[PDB]
């Protein structure tokens, strides 16, 4: 059997990359990958604190990593509390600045 002895890891080893870790936008599904296979084992705690409540969907991928997904409804600063085995990843918390309407640019050049 696979399950057995405790394989606790180290957050410092856990890696996080994607789009919902740096920037983001309102009413836009922003998820990211969480590399834990390189760290080891342990319980992962996720908590987003922003200007409003946002759903959080997680799932175990084939690679062994976890992909978090959320849907912001209000623009502001969403604090993504990423923890692993009772240890915050090397760089947390994750301050994700969400931008509302007003695309980066519309078209200052006719055509």
Curated annotation (Swiss-Prot):
Recorded domain comment: Comprised of a NH2-terminal actin-binding domain, 24 internally homologous repeats and two hinge regions. Repeat 24 and the second hinge domain are important for dimer formation. The first hinge region prevents binding to ITGA and ITGB subunits.
Protein name stated in the entry: Filamin-B
Disulphide bridges, residue numbers: none
Parent-protein residues present: 1999 to 2096 of 2602
Membrane-crossing segments per the record: none
Pathology linked to this chain's protein: Interaction with FLNA may compensate for dysfunctional FLNA homodimer in the periventricular nodular heterotopia (PVNH) disorder. Atelosteogenesis 1: A lethal chondrodysplasia characterized by distal hypoplasia of the humeri and femurs, hypoplasia of the mid-thoracic spine, occasionally complete lack of ossification of single hand bones, and the finding in cartilage of multiple degenerated chondrocytes which are encapsulated in fibrous tissue.
The species this protein was found in: Homo sapiens (Human)
Modification after translation (UniProt): ISGylation prevents ability to interact with the upstream activators of the JNK cascade and inhibits IFNA-induced JNK signaling. Ubiquitination by a SCF-like complex containing ASB2 isoform 1 leads to proteasomal degradation which promotes muscle differentiation.
Expressed in which tissues: Ubiquitous. Isoform 1 and isoform 2 are expressed in placenta, bone marrow, brain, umbilical vein endothelial cells (HUVEC), retina and skeletal muscle. Isoform 1 is predominantly expressed in prostate, uterus, liver, thyroid, stomach, lymph node, small intestine, spleen, skeletal muscle, kidney, placenta, pancreas, heart, lung, platelets, endothelial cells, megakaryocytic and erythroleukemic cell lines. Isoform 2 is predominantly expressed in spinal cord, platelet and Daudi cells.
Known function: Connects cell membrane constituents to the actin cytoskeleton. May promote orthogonal branching of actin filaments and links actin filaments to membrane glycoproteins. Anchors various transmembrane proteins to the actin cytoskeleton. Interaction with FLNA may allow neuroblast migration from the ventricular zone into the cortical plate. Various interactions and localizations of isoforms affect myotube morphology and myogenesis. Isoform 6 accelerates muscle differentiation in vitro.
Filamin repeat residues: 8-98
Family: Belongs to the filamin family.
Top-rank taxon, per record: Eukaryota
Sequence positions bearing Phosphoserine: 92
Oligomer and partners: Homodimer. Interacts with MICALL2. Interacts with RFLNA and RFLNB. Isoform 1 interacts with FBLP1, FLNA, FLNC, GP1BA, INPPL1, ITGB1A, PSEN1 and PSEN2. Isoform 3 interacts with ITGB1A, ITGB1D, ITGB3 and ITGB6. Interacts with MYOT and MYOZ1. Interacts with HBV capsid protein. Interacts with ASB2 isoform 1; the interaction targets FLNB for proteasomal degradation.
């Amino acid at each position: 059997g696979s399950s057995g002895s405790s394989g606790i890891g180290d957050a410092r080893r856990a890696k996080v990359y994607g789009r919902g870790l740096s920037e983001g936008r309102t009413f836009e599904m922003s998820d990211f990958i969480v590399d834990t296979r390189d760290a080891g084992y342990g319980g992962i705690s996720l908590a987003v604190e922003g200007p409003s409540k946002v759903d959080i969907q997680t799932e175990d991928l084939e690679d062994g990593t976890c992909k978090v997904s959320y849907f912001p409804t209000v623009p502001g600063v969403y604090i993504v509390s990423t923890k692993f085995a009772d240890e915050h990843v090397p760089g947390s918390p994750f301050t994700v600045k969400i931008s509302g309407e007003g695309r980066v640019k519309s078209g200052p050049s006719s055509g």
